[PDB]
């Protein structure tokens, strides 16, 4: 029952109160960190680990890249995508 970064990001993305700093782009499961540092700060609050910033957050995203969970969309700057559909991981 420990909160995972991919789960936290999904929760941010499905709440329109967060749309000014993180939002689905509308292509597949791609999303943009409109304010990367605000996303990082909120992950830090949630997971209880200041001083979280985007530099540190990017290390966790690179972890997800190496582990097949997330990809960084090339040609973009702060656009990522889920590889495995988070809803499908628990649909059964």
Description:
The protein has 92 residues and is α+β, with helices and mostly antiparallel strands. The chain has one domain: Arc Repressor Mutant, subunit A, CATH 1.10.10.10. 37% of the residues lie in helices and 15% in strands. The chain contains 3 helices and 4 strands; from the N terminus they run αββααββ. It is globular. It starts with a helix and ends in a 10-residue tail after the last strand. This is ETS translocation variant 5. It is found in: Nucleus. Binds to DNA sequences containing the consensus nucleotide core sequence 5'-GGAA.-3'.
Work out the helix count: 3
CATH class equals: Mainly Alpha
CATH superfamily: Winged helix-like DNA-binding domain superfamily/Winged helix DNA-binding domain
Strand content: 15-25%
Indicate how many domains the architecture comprises.
Answer: 1
Largest sheet: 4 strands, antiparallel
Strand order of the largest sheet: 1-2-4-3
Determine the fraction of residues in helical runs and give it as a percent range: 25-40%
Structural class: alpha+beta
β-strand number: 4
Radius of gyration: 13 Å
And the CATH topology? Answer: Arc Repressor Mutant, subunit A
CATH architecture identity: Orthogonal Bundle
From N to C, what is the helix and strand string? HEEHHEE
Overall geometric form: globular
What's the end-to-end separation, in Å? 18 Å
